[PDB]
Amino acid sequence: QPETLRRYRPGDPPLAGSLLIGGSGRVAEPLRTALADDYNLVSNNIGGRWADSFGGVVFDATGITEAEGLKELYTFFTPLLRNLAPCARVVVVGTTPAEAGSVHAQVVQRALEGFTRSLGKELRRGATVSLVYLSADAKPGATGLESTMRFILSAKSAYVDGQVFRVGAADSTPPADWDKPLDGKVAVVTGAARGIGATIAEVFARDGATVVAIDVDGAAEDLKRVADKVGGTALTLDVTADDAVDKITAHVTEHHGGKVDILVNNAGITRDKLLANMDEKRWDAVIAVNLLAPQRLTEGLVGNGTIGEGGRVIGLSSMAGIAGNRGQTNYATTKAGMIGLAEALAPVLADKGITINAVAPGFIETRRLNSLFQGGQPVDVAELIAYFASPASNAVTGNTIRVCGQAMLGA
Amino acid sequence: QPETLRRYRPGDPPLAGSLLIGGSGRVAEPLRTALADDYNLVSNNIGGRWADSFGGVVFDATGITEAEGLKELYTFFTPLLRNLAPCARVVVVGTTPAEAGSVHAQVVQRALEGFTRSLGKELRRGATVSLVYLSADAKPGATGLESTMRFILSAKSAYVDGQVFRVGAADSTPPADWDKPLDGKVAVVTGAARGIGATIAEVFARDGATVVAIDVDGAAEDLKRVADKVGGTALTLDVTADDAVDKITAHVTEHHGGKVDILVNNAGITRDKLLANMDEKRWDAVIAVNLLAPQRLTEGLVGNGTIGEGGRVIGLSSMAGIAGNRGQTNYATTKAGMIGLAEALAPVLADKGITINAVAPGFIETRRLNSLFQGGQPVDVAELIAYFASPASNAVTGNTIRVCGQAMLGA
Numbered sequence: 001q002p003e004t005l006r007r008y009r010p011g012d013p014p015l016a017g018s019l020l021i022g023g024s025g026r027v028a029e030p031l032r033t034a035l036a037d038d039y040n041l042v043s044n045n046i047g048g049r050w051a052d053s054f055g056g057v058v059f060d061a062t063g064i065t066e067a068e069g070l071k072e073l074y075t076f077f078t079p080l081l082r083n084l085a086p087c088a089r090v091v092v093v094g095t096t097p098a099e100a101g102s103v104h105a106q107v108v109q110r111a112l113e114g115f116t117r118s119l120g121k122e123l124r125r126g127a128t129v130s131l132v133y134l135s136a137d138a139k140p141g142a143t144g145l146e147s148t149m150r151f152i153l154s155a156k157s158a159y160v161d162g163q164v165f166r167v168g169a170a171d172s173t174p175p176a177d178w179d180k181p182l183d184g185k186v187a188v189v190t191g192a193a194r195g196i197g198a199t200i201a202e203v204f205a206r207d208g209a210t211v212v213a214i215d216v217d218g219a220a221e222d223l224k225r226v227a228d229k230v231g232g233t234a235l236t237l238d239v240t241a242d243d244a245v246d247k248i249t250a251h252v253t254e255h256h257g258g259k260v261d262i263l264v265n266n267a268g269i270t271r272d273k274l275l276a277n278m279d280e281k282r283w284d285a286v287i288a289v290n291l292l293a294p295q296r297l298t299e300g301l302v303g304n305g306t307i308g309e310g311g312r313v314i315g316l317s318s319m320a321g322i323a324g325n326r327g328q329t330n331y332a333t334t335k336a337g338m339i340g341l342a343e344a345l346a347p348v349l350a351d352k353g354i355t356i357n358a359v360a361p362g363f364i365e366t367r368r369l370n371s372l373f374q375g376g377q378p379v380d381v382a383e384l385i386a387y388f389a390s391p392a393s394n395a396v397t398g399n400t401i402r403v404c405g406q407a408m409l410g411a
Numbered sequence: 412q413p414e415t416l417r418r419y420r421p422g423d424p425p426l427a428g429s430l431l432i433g434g435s436g437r438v439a440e441p442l443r444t445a446l447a448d449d450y451n452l453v454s455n456n457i458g459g460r461w462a463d464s465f466g467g468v469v470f471d472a473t474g475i476t477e478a479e480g481l482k483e484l485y486t487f488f489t490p491l492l493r494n495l496a497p498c499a500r501v502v503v504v505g506t507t508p509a510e511a512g513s514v515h516a517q518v519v520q521r522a523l524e525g526f527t528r529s530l531g532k533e534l535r536r537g538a539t540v541s542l543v544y545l546s547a548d549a550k551p552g553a554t555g556l557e558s559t560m561r562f563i564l565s566a567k568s569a570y571v572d573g574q575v576f577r578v579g580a581a582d583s584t585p586p587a588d589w590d591k592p593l594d595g596k597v598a599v600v601t602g603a604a605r606g607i608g609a610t611i612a613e614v615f616a617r618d619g620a621t622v623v624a625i626d627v628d629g630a631a632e633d634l635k636r637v638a639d640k641v642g643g644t645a646l647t648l649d650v651t652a653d654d655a656v657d658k659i660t661a662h663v664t665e666h667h668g669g670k671v672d673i674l675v676n677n678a679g680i681t682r683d684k685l686l687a688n689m690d691e692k693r694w695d696a697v698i699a700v701n702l703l704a705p706q707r708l709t710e711g712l713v714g715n716g717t718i719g720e721g722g723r724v725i726g727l728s729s730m731a732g733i734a735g736n737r738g739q740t741n742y743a744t745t746k747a748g749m750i751g752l753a754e755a756l757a758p759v760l761a762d763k764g765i766t767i768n769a770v771a772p773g774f775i776e777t778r779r780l781n782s783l784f785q786g787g788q789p790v791d792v793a794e795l796i797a798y799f800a801s802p803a804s805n806a807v808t809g810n811t812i813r814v815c816g817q818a819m820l821g822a
């Protein structure tokens with residue numbers, strides 16, 4: 001039977017149980033220190049006695065440098081798995097493999113992904129697995145890791161499973177309130193009149209953001225309703241229009257102090273057709289909306305300073321961009337291009353204090369061939385986007401993370 | 412209905428039809444020059460008239476630098492798809508995205524993978540798609556690309572579909588005979604008494620190699636039969652033994668002039684068990700054979716000079732190492748570690764003129780959830796390994812290529 005997944009609501013504790021952090025690397029102790037107040041931390045013990053089920057189990061693998069040392073994964077996890085609660089979170093933290101410092105160490109840190117993806121296919125009742133890599137150059141405090149662990153170790157990550165998160169070397173500052181992490185931020189969401197975009201607006205506003213909801217003229221009525229519901233503003237415009245950057249710039253100058261902290265390139269279309277049967281309009285329309293427009297909005301709003309230091313850009317990719325899909329040579333090209341935008345701009349935007357990442361949804365109820373045996377919800381996608389958008393996620397850039405319940409499909 | 416795939420046999424032309432090479436980049440013309448004698452090259456024409464079906468179609472995308480330029484994929488391929496023969500080969504050649512020279516160019520070169528993987532899911536009757544990336548620093552002649560194109564553009568690649576090949580900057584020398592590419596090479600194949608290993612030995616010997624077939628004492632009878640059939644030698648040994656490197660070194664010194672040109676780390680075991688139910692022997696045995704032994708044989712034989720300039724190391728990974736598999740936290744860790752060995756040693760071994768790569772088989776008859784709607788054969792795996800082993804594949808290192816018929820499963 002498919003598990004009814006717990007999802008986030010204000011005031012509900014992050015985990016449905018205790019948090020055990022172990023392993024003998026460089027992140028276990030600073031992570032225990034950082035999470036002790038908001039989580040119910042418990043220590044490991046040889047007797048295998050714990051009053052509560054584990055809501056979260058984190059293994060710090062950053063100290064493993066030899067294949068003989070991989071046995072620590074086995075000895076740590078085997079006594080703990082039967083105490084996992086439904087919808088528990090299992091996380092392994094390693095070192096970015098190319099930075100691990102020796103051939104042997106790079107081999108074992110790379111091997112961790114085989115372990116985590118397999119373990120995810122063994123967990124039951126909605127529990128998920130995650131692999132987080134941390135740069136070898138992060139400071140001892142590992143503050144740049146905190147927003148990633150807090151996203152994973154919460155109900156917000158309910159439909160993210162089997163994924164790899166890649167954290168760089170930079171220190172982070174926490175938001176004033178981890179429960180309102182986007183407080184004071186101005187967020188532009190394209191395609192916000194319906195679907196995933198409308199839910200992104202709601203989750204952003206839940207987290208304290210001021211949302212500029214963008215959609216086409218034909219959706220003006222629904223767009224205003226979304227904007228009013230979230231306490232934000234509605235901007236009707238076609239993202240392919242020549243003056244799109246001008247219009248967004250004028251709008252946030254008029255209403256929101258002249259800046260954009262978060263840009264979500266969510267607007268998109270499909271024109272499905274086998275390539276042998278496709279005409280030019282079906283190709284061109286899809287490239288214009290799904291690839292040219294996100295590139296132009298991102299470069300234009302960074303280029304005129306509207307998005308500045310602390311900025312966050314998130315693009316909507318798709319599993320079709322990663323695995324391909326019959327009838328979608330146009331669409332999948334644009335969604336692989338959205339990954340390309342994150343990967344190509346990440347070093348360029350890092351000089352400006354801006355991150356850029358991509359989310360690749362799988363099956364979103366807008367089904368069963370995944371570890372959670374169910375389809376995702378729009379809120380599950382919006383939560384991953386909000387994680388990237390956090391002011392505390394400054395050390396997370398160039399990532400593509402799938403929100404798919406650990407779907408079988410992929411590359 | 413599943414297509415009966417054409418596979419390689421000496422004297423059969425490489426393609427089942429003509430070869431059309433197009434696109435306006437830096438590889439179209441030198442590739443036409445290199446392949447003109449052995450292939451039946453035809454030019455594109457606006458009338459759409461060709462006497463024969465296409466056995467191969469190659470599009471050079473290295474000149475595309477702007478998303479508006481991606482339309483060349485559409486205009487080139489749409490008139491050509493209906494003339495593809497059964498088991499045809501479609502290839503797109505691009506530039507390594509991080510080397511493409513501008514943000515816009517990196518975006519479009521990265522986007523090519525969405526296009527190719529989608530097109531593969533539209534081709535019919537056994538035809539396959541491939542994406543090849545070539546370093547921006549390759550010389551105009553693109554000689555380092557030739558062994559990759561010749562593998563793809565042949566029946567040898569029958570079960571390789573949807574994959575990405577990554578070619579570096581180095582020039583290559585062709586073998587004296589592309590139909591006996593391993594002539595004169597000494598190849599060590601572990602686990603060669605049965606299964607995929609026995610077929611690797613046969614394909615290597617077909618291609619002209621002298622094979623050292625390695626397996627355990629209990630398989631001595633079958634091992635000798637394989638060795639005799641391929642004209643090579645049998646070496647009984649357990650690859651986990653302390654003196655394994657010594658014994659291989661002594662064996663090739665006694666019989667094969669003291670050197671190893673090709674090492675295939677194929678021996679492997681499984682001990683499947685849910686991690687919660689697994690004991691220490693099931694973990695340790697799998698790490699010892701599948702990860703520690705390949706690392707030790709590779710580093711030991713490079714370290715004592717038995718594998719030198721021109722050497723080739725190929726490891727057997729697995730789709731389980733990429734996607735994970737229930738009950739295989741031990742096995743999948745080792746198969747992700749085999750990818751880690753290729754990725755970590757590639758820069759170290761490049762200083763010695765040695766490449767190292769990994770092959771990840773999917774479903775090998777030892778089924779239907781792939782683009783070819785059928786399971787692979789051991790020969791299909793062996794052909795991909797022989798491609799890496801070619802003396803002309805010196806510009807191919809650090810690659811992991813799946814042999815899966817474009818399986819739906821993955822990461």
Ligand SMILES: NC(=O)c1ccc[n+]([C@@H]2O[C@H](COP(=O)([O-])OP(=O)(O)OC[C@H]3O[C@@H](n4cnc5c(N)ncnc54)[C@H](O)[C@@H]3O)[C@@H](O)[C@H]2O)c1
Pocket residue numbers: 190191192193194195196197214215216219237238239240265266267268269289316317318319360361362363364365366
């Ligand atoms: N299962 C899924 O729905 C799914 C899966 C993977 C990825 N995605 C991606 O997620 C995003 C949201 O998908 P969705 O299913 O909610 O889509 P949708 O079609 O329901 O909504 C997209 C919105 O974008 C708007 N839009 C389209 N073209 C526009 C333009 N030129 N200018 C401004 N607004 C424009 C539409 O009017 C619409 O309100 C898209 O980028 C889509 O490709 C969706």
Ligand SMILES: NC(=O)c1ccc[n+]([C@@H]2O[C@H](COP(=O)([O-])OP(=O)(O)OC[C@H]3O[C@@H](n4cnc5c(N)ncnc54)[C@H](O)[C@@H]3O)[C@@H](O)[C@H]2O)c1
Pocket residue numbers: 601602603604605606607608625626627630648649650651676677678679680700727728729730771772773774775776777
């Ligand atoms: N479908 C598949 O068969 C499949 C799929 C993906 C990957 N692989 C990998 O491909 C390789 C070959 O698989 P296979 O199915 O042919 O396996 P197999 O079990 O049929 O044969 C492997 C051979 O290795 C030998 N071997 C095992 N331990 C050894 C040791 N310590 N020293 C020396 N020889 C040893 C065995 O005796 C056997 O002859 C393995 O690495 C396997 O993990 C196989």
Ligand SMILES: [Cl-]
Pocket residue numbers: 025026062063
């Ligand atoms: Cl450490």
Ligand SMILES: [Cl-]
Pocket residue numbers: 273274277
């Ligand atoms: Cl169609």
Ligand SMILES: [Cl-]
Pocket residue numbers: 436437473474
């Ligand atoms: Cl060029």
Ligand SMILES: [Cl-]
Pocket residue numbers: 684685688
């Ligand atoms: Cl079991």
